[PDB]
C-alpha cells in the first residue's frame, strides 16, 4: 500500500487580489512555510515518483463562467 | 500585410508561398447536420447571447 503523510496549513495567508498587478508579484504576497519529515522516504529497490494532493482556494471566484467563452475573471 | 497574386494559378499554388511566409494554416471542416453546431454560430458580450439570432 502507498504511504500517505498529512501536511496541515496553520496561518491564514488569504489576500485581496484587487490591488495587485497581473500576474501577481509573488515576492510581496503573504506566505506560510510547511515542513514535513519522512523517516523512510523509499525503502524499496526502485525509484519512487512522489505524489501531492493540494487544496485549491476556499473563496468564490470573481466572475461567473459562460461555456463557449474564455473566462476573463482570473486576475481578480 | 501581404500580396496575393495569380494569373490562372491553382489556389494551392497561389496560397503556398503566402501561407509559408505568414506562418498560417488553411483549415476545412464539413458541416454534418444533427451532430455539428452551425459553422457561423458564436457567443458575445457580458451575458453570452448568440451574436446573430436565428
Amino acid at each position: 500500500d502507498d504511504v500517505v503523510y498529512p501536511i496541515e496549513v496553520q496561518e491564514d495567508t488569504t489576500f485581496d487580489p484587487n490591488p495587485l498587478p497581473w500576474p501577481w508579484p509573488q515576492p510581496e504576497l503573504p506566505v506560510e512555510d510547511i515542513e514535513i519529515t519522512v523517516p523512510n522516504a523509499n525503502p524499496t529497490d526502485n525509484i519512487i515518483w512522489p505524489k501531492w494532493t493540494l487544496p485549491g482556494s476556499s473563496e468564490k471566484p470573481a466572475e461567473p463562467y459562460i461555456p463557449g467563452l474564455p473566462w476573463l475573471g482570473a486576475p481578480k | 500585410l501581404t500580396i496575393v497574386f495569380s494569373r490562372f494559378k491553382s489556389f494551392h499554388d497561389t496560397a503556398k508561398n503566402v501561407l509559408a511566409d505568414s506562418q498560417l494554416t488553411i483549415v476545412c471542416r464539413r458541416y454534418f447536420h444533427g451532430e455539428d453546431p452551425h459553422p457561423f454560430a458564436e457567443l458575445s458580450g457580458e451575458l453570452g447571447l448568440p451574436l446573430i439570432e436565428g
Side-chain angles (χ1 to χ4, degrees), chain A residues 13-65:
Chain A
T13 53
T14 312
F15 56 82
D16 186 350
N18 296 271
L20 305 177
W22 186 245
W24 301 332
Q26 193 163 0
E28 68 172 43
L29 295 181
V31 196
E32 192 189 353
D33 295 331
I34 328 295
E35 292 176 14
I36 190 159
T37 303
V38 175
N40 296 289
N42 183 10
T44 82
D45 65 280
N46 295 292
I47 71 169
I48 287 300
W49 300 101
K51 297 110 175 67
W52 309 87
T53 60
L54 309 176
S57 179
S58 57
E59 293 216 318
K60 68 177 293 188
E63 296 189 10
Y65 165 57

Side-chain angles (χ1 to χ4, degrees), chain B residues 5 11 17 25 30 36 48-50:
Chain B
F5 74 93
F11 185 86
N17 290 341
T25 312
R30 289 200 189 261
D36 294 335
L49 291 312

Side-chain angles (χ1 to χ4, degrees), chain B residues 19 35 38 40 44 47 49 54:
Chain B
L19 288 167
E35 68 198 87
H38 188 282
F40 306 159
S44 187
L47 281 82
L49 291 312

Side-chain angles (χ1 to χ4, degrees), chain B residues 9-37:
Chain B
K9 287 198 286 184
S10 78
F11 185 86
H12 176 71
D13 292 302
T14 302
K16 161 148 42 75
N17 290 341
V18 178
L19 288 167
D21 291 342
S22 312
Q23 309 189 2
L24 294 175
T25 312
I26 175 153
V27 301
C28 57
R29 192 171 173 108
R30 289 200 189 261
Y31 177 40
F32 292 166
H33 287 195
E35 68 198 87
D36 294 335

